[PDB]
Structure formats: C-alpha cells, structure tokens
Amino acid sequence: SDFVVIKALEDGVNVIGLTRGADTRFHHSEKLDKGEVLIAQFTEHTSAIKVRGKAYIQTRHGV
Amino acid sequence: SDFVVIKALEDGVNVIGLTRGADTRFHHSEKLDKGEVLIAQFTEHTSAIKVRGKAYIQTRHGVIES
Amino acid sequence: SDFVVIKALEDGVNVIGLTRGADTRFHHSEKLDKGEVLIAQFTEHTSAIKVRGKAYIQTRHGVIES
Amino acid sequence: SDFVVIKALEDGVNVIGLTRGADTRFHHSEKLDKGEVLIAQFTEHTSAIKVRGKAYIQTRHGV
Amino acid sequence: SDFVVIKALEDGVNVIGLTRGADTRFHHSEKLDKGEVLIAQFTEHTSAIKVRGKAYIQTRHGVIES
Amino acid sequence: SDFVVIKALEDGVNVIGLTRGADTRFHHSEKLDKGEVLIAQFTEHTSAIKVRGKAYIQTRHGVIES
Amino acid sequence: SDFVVIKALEDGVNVIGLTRGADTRFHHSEKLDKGEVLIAQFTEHTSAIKVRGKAYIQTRHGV
Amino acid sequence: SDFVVIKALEDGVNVIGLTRGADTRFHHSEKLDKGEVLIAQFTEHTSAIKVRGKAYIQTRHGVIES
Amino acid sequence: SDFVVIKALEDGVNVIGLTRGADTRFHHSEKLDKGEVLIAQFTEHTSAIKVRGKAYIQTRHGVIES
Amino acid sequence: SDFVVIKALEDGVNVIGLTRGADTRFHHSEKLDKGEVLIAQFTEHTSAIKVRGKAYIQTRHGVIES
Amino acid sequence: SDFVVIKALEDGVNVIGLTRGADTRFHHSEKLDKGEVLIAQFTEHTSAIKVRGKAYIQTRHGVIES
Amino acid sequence: SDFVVIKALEDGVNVIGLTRGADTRFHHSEKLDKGEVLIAQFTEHTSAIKVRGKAYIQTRHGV
Ligand SMILES: N[C@@H](Cc1c[nH]c2ccccc12)C(=O)O
Ligand SMILES: N[C@@H](Cc1c[nH]c2ccccc12)C(=O)O
Ligand SMILES: N[C@@H](Cc1c[nH]c2ccccc12)C(=O)O
Ligand SMILES: N[C@@H](Cc1c[nH]c2ccccc12)C(=O)O
Ligand SMILES: N[C@@H](Cc1c[nH]c2ccccc12)C(=O)O
Ligand SMILES: N[C@@H](Cc1c[nH]c2ccccc12)C(=O)O
Ligand SMILES: N[C@@H](Cc1c[nH]c2ccccc12)C(=O)O
Ligand SMILES: N[C@@H](Cc1c[nH]c2ccccc12)C(=O)O
Ligand SMILES: N[C@@H](Cc1c[nH]c2ccccc12)C(=O)O
Ligand SMILES: N[C@@H](Cc1c[nH]c2ccccc12)C(=O)O
Ligand SMILES: N[C@@H](Cc1c[nH]c2ccccc12)C(=O)O
Ligand SMILES: N[C@@H](Cc1c[nH]c2ccccc12)C(=O)O
C-alpha cells in the first residue's frame, strides 16, 4: 500500500492520522522531534494524513 | 488507491470531501494553516475533493500551485 | 479510478456530473470560484463530467487550459 | 475505463453516445458551447462516441 | 478495450462495423461528414471495422492519414 | 485482443480470415478498394489473417508496406 | 496471444503449423504468393510454425 | 511488500514499529549502532516505522540522509 | 508463452524438443534447410529445445548467430 | 518475493533474521567471512533483516557499501 | 517461465538439471558439442541448472561467456 | 521465481541452499569448479542462498 515519508525539520512535528470511513476524526498523532523520520502507510484505519510543523515529505508524487 | 497532496500557501485553506454515491454533499472540511500538508486518498466515502484557498496541489497528473 | 483535476480561472465555473447508465442527466453541479480546485473521480454514479467556465483541466491525457 | 476529452471550439458541438449492443443508435447527445469541456467514458451503455462540430479532442492515442 | 479514432477528411466517409462471430456481415454504417470524428471500440458485437473514404485514423499502432 | 490495420494501396485487396481450431479454412474474405482501411481483431473464430494485394499493414510488431 | 507476421518474397512460400501436444506433425500449410502477408497466432492447436521459402518475418523479438 | 532500508550513522539509533489497526502503539524498538543496517518490511503487524537518531534511509521514494 | 526463433544458416540444422516432466527424452526433431525458419513455443510437452547446426537464434534474451 | 544481497567486506559479518508476527525476536544469525555472499528473501518467517559489520548491501532500492 | 540459453564453446559441455523439492540431485545431463545450443526452462521438476564446460550463457540477468 | 547466477572463479565454490521455514539450516551445498555456472532459483524449499568462494554473481539487482 501507498505510504508517506516524513522527516521533521523542527521539534514537535505532528503526523496526524484521520479515520477511514463515513466519519473523519483524528485517531492518532505521532510526534516527531527534529531529524526523526516516520514512514507511514495508508491502511484500513487511516485514509488521510495531515502533517503540522516544518517537515520534508516524500510521497509517490515527489517531495 | 489514488491520493492528492495539498500544501496550504496561506492560512484558512479548506480541503473538502464530497460523498461517494447517488447523492453529493460535503461530508468533511479540513482546515490547513500556511505550510500544513494534507495527503488524502479517494475512498469508499470520498469520490471528489474540493480545495479552497491558495494551495500547492499534487496528484498523479502533476502539480498546480496557486 | 480515473479522475480529473479542475482549477477555476474565473468565478462561477460549474463542474457537472452526468449519470452512469442507460439514462443521462445532470445529477450534481459543483460551483468553483476563481482559484478553487476540484479533483473528481469517475464513479458508479458518474460516467461523464462537463466543465463550464474558464478552467485549467488535467486528466491522464494531458492539459487543457483557457 | 477509457475516456475522451472534448473541448468545444464553437457553439453547438454535439457529443453523441452510441448504444453498446447488437443495435446502434444514439441514446444521448450532449451539447457543448464554445470553451466547454466534456470528459466522457466508454461504459456499459456507450461503445462509440461521435463528435459533430469543431472541437479539440484528446484520447489515449493523442489529440 | 481497444478503440479506433476516425476523423473524416471529406464528406461521405463511412465507418462500418462487422459482426463478431462465425458469420461476418455489416451490422452498422456510420456516416461522417468532413471534420466529424468517431471514436469506436471493439465490442461483444463488433470485431472488425472498415473505413471507406478519405480519413485520418488513429489506433494503438499509430496513424494513417488519407 | 490483438488487431491488424490494413490499408489497401490498390483496388481489389482481399483480407481473409482463417478459422480458429483443429481445422483451417477461409471463413470470410473482405474486399478493400484503394484507400479503404480494415481494422480487424483476432477472435474466437479467427486465428490467422491473410492479405492479398498491395497493402500497408500495421500490427503490434510494426509496419509492412508495398 | 503471440503471433508472427510473414510476408512472402517469392511465390509458393509455405507457412506450416505444427500440432500442439505430445505428437508433432503439420496440420496445415498456408501457401503465400509473392507480396502476400499472413499474420498467424499461436493457438490451442498450433504451438510451432515453420516457414519454408524466402520471407520477411516479424515476431515479438524483431525481424 | 514495501520495505525500508535504515543505516545508522551513529550509535544508538532506534527503529520503531507502530502497530497496524485501530490502535497505534510502539510494539518493537530495534537498536542499531553505527554502520549497522536494518531492512524492514511493512507487515500484518507494522503499518508505520519511526526512526530516531542520525540515519541514512532508503525507500521506494528515494533517499533521506543525516 | 515464451518462444524461440531459429533460422538455419546451413542445411541439416536440427531443432529438437525435450519432454517436460520427471523424465527427459527427445520427442521430436525438426530439420531445417538453409534459410528455413522455425518459431517454436515452450509448451505443456516441451520444456527445453536443443539446436544442432549453424543457426541464427532469437529469444527474449537476445540473439545468437553461428 | 523481495530479497537482499549482502557481501561481507570483513570477517565476522552477521546477517540476522527477525521473526514475522506480533512478536519480534532474532531467529537466526548467519555469519559471513570476508567476501562471502548471502542472498536472502523476506519470507513467511522473516520480515526484517539486520546486518552487523562492514558489508556491501543491495536491494531493489539500490546499494549501501560500508 | 524463466529460461536459460546455453551455447557450447567447446565439445562435451554438460547442462545438468537439479531436482526441485526437498531433495536435490542431478536428474538429467544434456551434452552439447561445440556450437550447439540448449534453451532450457525452469520447471516443475528443475529448479537449478548447472553448466560445465566452456559456454556462452544468457539469462534475464544478462550474459556470461568463457 | 527469482534466481541467482553463480560463476565459480576458483575450484571448490560452494553454493549453499538454506531451508525455507521457521528453522534455518543448509539442506544442500552444490560445489562448482572454476568456470562452472549454476543458475539457481528460490523455491518452496530454499529461501536464502550463501556463496562461499570467489564467484561472479548476478541477481535481479545487478552483479
Ligand atoms: N494503527 C495505525 C498506524 C498508522 C499508519 N499510518 C498512520 C499515519 C498517521 C497516524 C497513524 C498511522 C493504522 O494502522 O492505520
Ligand atoms: N473519513 C474520510 C477521510 C478522507 C479521506 N480523503 C478525504 C478527503 C477530504 C476529506 C476527508 C477525507 C474517508 O475515509 O473518506
Ligand atoms: N456523489 C458523486 C460525487 C462525484 C464524483 N465525481 C463527480 C463529478 C461531478 C459531480 C459529482 C461527482 C459520485 O460519487 O459520483
Ligand atoms: N449515461 C451515459 C453517459 C455517457 C458516458 N459517456 C458518454 C458519451 C456520450 C454520451 C453520453 C455518455 C453512459 O453511462 O453511457
Ligand atoms: N452497437 C455497436 C456500436 C459500435 C461500436 N464500435 C463500432 C464500430 C463500427 C460500427 C458500430 C460500432 C457495438 O456495441 O458493437
Ligand atoms: N466474424 C469475424 C469477423 C472478423 C474479425 N477479424 C477478421 C479478419 C478477417 C476476416 C473476418 C474477421 C470474427 O469475429 O472472427
Ligand atoms: N486453425 C489453425 C489456424 C492457424 C493459426 N496459426 C497458424 C499457423 C500456421 C498454420 C495454421 C494456423 C489454428 O487455430 O491453430
Ligand atoms: N507438439 C510439440 C510442438 C513443439 C513446440 N515447440 C517445439 C520445440 C521443438 C520440437 C517440437 C515443438 C509441442 O506442443 O510441444
Ligand atoms: N515482528 C515484526 C517485525 C518487523 C517488521 N518490520 C518492522 C519495523 C519495525 C519494528 C519491527 C518490525 C513484524 O512482522 O511486523
Ligand atoms: N524433463 C525436464 C527437461 C528440462 C528442462 N530444463 C532442464 C534443464 C536441465 C536438464 C533438463 C531440463 C523438465 O521438464 O524439467
Ligand atoms: N531441491 C532444491 C534445489 C535448489 C534450488 N535452488 C538452490 C540453491 C542452493 C541449493 C539448492 C537449490 C530446491 O528445489 O530448493
Ligand atoms: N528459514 C529462514 C531463512 C531466511 C530467509 N531470509 C533470511 C534472512 C535472515 C536469516 C534467515 C533467513 C526463512 O525462511 O525465513
């Protein structure tokens, strides 16, 4: 499945997973400190991801 | 599944999901402040996405930057 | 599924979904004001999409702008 | 499924859908005024499309 | 499904569908006047297409222009 | 399915379908006069196609003209 | 399915289909006169094709 | 399945697997000392991977180093 | 299915099919005189092909010419 | 299935398989002396691979050489 | 299925099939004299192929000659 | 299925097949003398291959 790479460029970057389904709420926010990397898939439970905070982001489409 | 990347270029950007099915209504609006990024799929419940406000948008087709 | 990207180049653009099946009528018209973007799939209910008004459009086939 | 993009270059362009099946008749003609765009798929009901009137047309094969 | 694009370069162009199956007969002829375009699929009922008259033809294989 | 494009370069070209199966005979010959085009698939009933007469032919493998 | 294009460069070119199965015999030979073209698939009944006589031949691999 | 390559550029790098499903918690942290490499898949149990510490990382999307 | 093209560069070329299965024996030898061409598939009954004599051979991997 | 190539650039290289499933433990360590090569798949039992020691590593993503 | 092309560069080359399954033994050795070619698949019965003697070999991975 | 090409550059190269499953042991070692080539697949029984001895090796990833 499709996935996103997020590298935090400041402390306190929040990678926010939004619920798949008729309803949309955040079910999880993963905090990254500067330099940390999250590689996160879309899944049965997560159909949108929001990134709040300065970050270098890669997807299938580019940076 | 296909997905869209939206980066807000100003405060107050709204990304709106439109319901899949015979009927079409807004089911969710996600607000983005300047520099926030939303990576959103098309899904069982969302078959169209509307973006209001200055934004950099990427899909499989390429890029559109306000 | 195949999808279309529509960016309105003026106020009051309309993106219209036409019904899939033996019958063909408009089932929804989404209005876009200048700079607003709609990313819209073909679906179980929508098998043709009509754009009225000055728009920049992207599909798998390329770009069409004015 | 395969689809066609039609941009009308004059008023009154007719995008004509022909019935899939043993019989061939038009079941729908969608009129486009100048500058309007139709993006239309081939479907269970439509296996040929005729465009009458000046138009810029894109398919999988080109313009 | 595979499809052919035919643009008439003169009046009186005919695009003819030949029946799929053990037997081969013309089942439909669509007339095109100069500049009209037909985009036609191969289908359950059509396994060959004949074009008579001056025409620009595109398939997956490339182009043939009268 | 695989298909062949045949453009007649003279009058009286024949495009012949040979039967699929343990037996092989001609089941149809389509005549093409100069400039006429046939786009013909391989099918449940046709597993070889013979072209007689000066023709420009395109397949997935390329072009063959004279 | 895979197919071969044979263009005869002399009269009397024979395109020979060999039987698919435990046994190998020719079941059909299609004669081509000079300039004639056969486009022939591999099939349930034909798993090898022999061409006897001067011919220009195209397959998936080239000429 | 998709996989990530992580090379530690300092001692004490941690590669953390986050649980797949409605709940999200860390289920494993693998420590890597300088020069050590982990090649890790996404799996039935792991749907996000977090890297803490200076690392060179490769995925299908490219490289990310520091 | 994968296939091999063999063109004989001299008289007396033999193309030999080896049986698919636990046992391996020659089940057929086709003779080619100079300039004759055999296009042969791998099949339910043939899992290896041996060519003896000067020949030009093409497969998916490329060409070998004696 | 995806696989990794590891060539040891010094003696004492260890390639360690980590168990697939809810739990993560080392299930095997293969030692490589200088110049030995291991080509290892991801499998029903192995969903992550750890390499300790100076090594040249190749995956689908590219190469990492100590 | 994957296949290998072997051209003998000297007399007495042997192409050996090793058995697929829990056990591994030689089930067939095909002798090739200089210039002879074997095109051999991997199969239900053969999961490794050994070549002894000076040979030019082609696989999906490229060429190996001497 | 994926496969490896091994060409021995010395006598006594050992191409070692490791068992697929929860347990990892070698089930077979195929010896190659200098110049001999083994082309070996991954299989139901073999999920890792170790090559001991100087060898030129090709896989899907390169040499
Ligand atoms: N348990 C979550 C983990 C996750 C994956 N991608 C994410 C993106 C953001 C937040 C959490 C996640 C899930 O399987 O969906
Ligand atoms: N709950 C929504 C989440 C979502 C995905 N893509 C979106 C685009 C816009 C708004 C919401 C969404 C869904 O699964 O469909
Ligand atoms: N409810 C509509 C939403 C939609 C998708 N694409 C469209 C194009 C135009 C208008 C509406 C739509 C549907 O699922 O079909
Ligand atoms: N109801 C029609 C809509 C349509 C799709 N493509 C068309 C082309 C021309 C005219 C109408 C159409 C159908 O589903 O087939
Ligand atoms: N009713 C015809 C329509 C058609 C498709 N392709 C054609 C080509 C020529 C003539 C008619 C057609 C069919 O479904 O087969
Ligand atoms: N009825 C024929 C039509 C046909 C297709 N390809 C052909 C080539 C030659 C002659 C006839 C045909 C069929 O379905 O097979
Ligand atoms: N009836 C034969 C026709 C054929 C196809 N390819 C051929 C090649 C050579 C000779 C005959 C054929 C078959 O279906 O197999
Ligand atoms: N009857 C043989 C025909 C054949 C195909 N490929 C071959 C190669 C060599 C010799 C014979 C053949 C078979 O189906 O297998
Ligand atoms: N037992 C874990 C192993 C694993 C794979 N990828 C990981 C990434 C991080 C931590 C552990 C892992 C699993 O199968 O999911
Ligand atoms: N009967 C053997 C034939 C074979 C195919 N590839 C080989 C390689 C070497 C030796 C024999 C073979 C089989 O089907 O497996
Ligand atoms: N019988 C073994 C043969 C084999 C294939 N690849 C190997 C690699 C190394 C050693 C033996 C093998 C198997 O099918 O798995
Ligand atoms: N028995 C192990 C063999 C293995 C494959 N890849 C590995 C990587 C590291 C260690 C062991 C392995 C398995 O099938 O999973």
Short mmCIF file of C-alpha atoms and ligand atoms in Angstrom, two decimals, chain A residues 15-18 27-30 38 40-46 48-49, chain H residues 18-25 47-48, ligand 1:
data_model
loop_
_atom_site.label_atom_id
_atom_site.label_comp_id
_atom_site.label_asym_id
_atom_site.label_seq_id
_atom_site.Cartn_x
_atom_site.Cartn_y
_atom_site.Cartn_z
CA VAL A 15 1.83 13.43 11.88
CA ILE A 16 -1.91 13.06 12.21
CA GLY A 17 -3.86 10.02 11.00
CA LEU A 18 -7.51 10.59 10.04
CA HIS A 27 -7.33 8.76 15.80
CA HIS A 28 -3.61 9.23 16.31
CA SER A 29 -0.99 11.93 16.23
CA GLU A 30 2.64 10.77 16.14
CA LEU A 38 8.23 8.45 10.13
CA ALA A 40 3.62 5.70 7.41
CA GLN A 41 1.22 3.75 5.20
CA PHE A 42 -2.38 4.35 4.31
CA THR A 43 -4.30 1.48 5.88
CA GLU A 44 -7.68 0.01 6.78
CA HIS A 45 -7.89 2.63 9.54
CA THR A 46 -6.10 5.66 8.02
CA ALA A 48 -5.76 10.78 5.13
CA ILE A 49 -2.65 12.08 6.86
CA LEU H 18 3.99 1.02 15.20
CA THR H 19 1.01 -1.36 15.33
CA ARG H 20 -1.35 -1.83 12.42
CA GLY H 21 -5.04 -1.47 13.23
CA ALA H 22 -7.44 0.85 15.04
CA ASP H 23 -4.90 1.26 17.85
CA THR H 24 -1.39 2.68 17.42
CA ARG H 25 1.44 1.98 19.86
CA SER H 47 2.00 -0.14 9.32
CA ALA H 48 4.33 2.75 10.26
N1 LIG M 1 -2.57 1.97 13.74
C1 LIG M 1 -2.43 2.93 12.57
C2 LIG M 1 -0.95 3.32 12.38
C3 LIG M 1 -0.73 4.34 11.28
C4 LIG M 1 -0.41 4.06 9.96
N2 LIG M 1 -0.30 5.23 9.24
C5 LIG M 1 -0.52 6.29 10.07
C6 LIG M 1 -0.49 7.68 9.79
C7 LIG M 1 -0.74 8.54 10.84
C8 LIG M 1 -1.04 8.07 12.15
C9 LIG M 1 -1.05 6.68 12.43
C10 LIG M 1 -0.80 5.77 11.37
C11 LIG M 1 -3.00 2.30 11.29
O1 LIG M 1 -2.76 1.09 11.06
O2 LIG M 1 -3.68 2.98 10.47
#
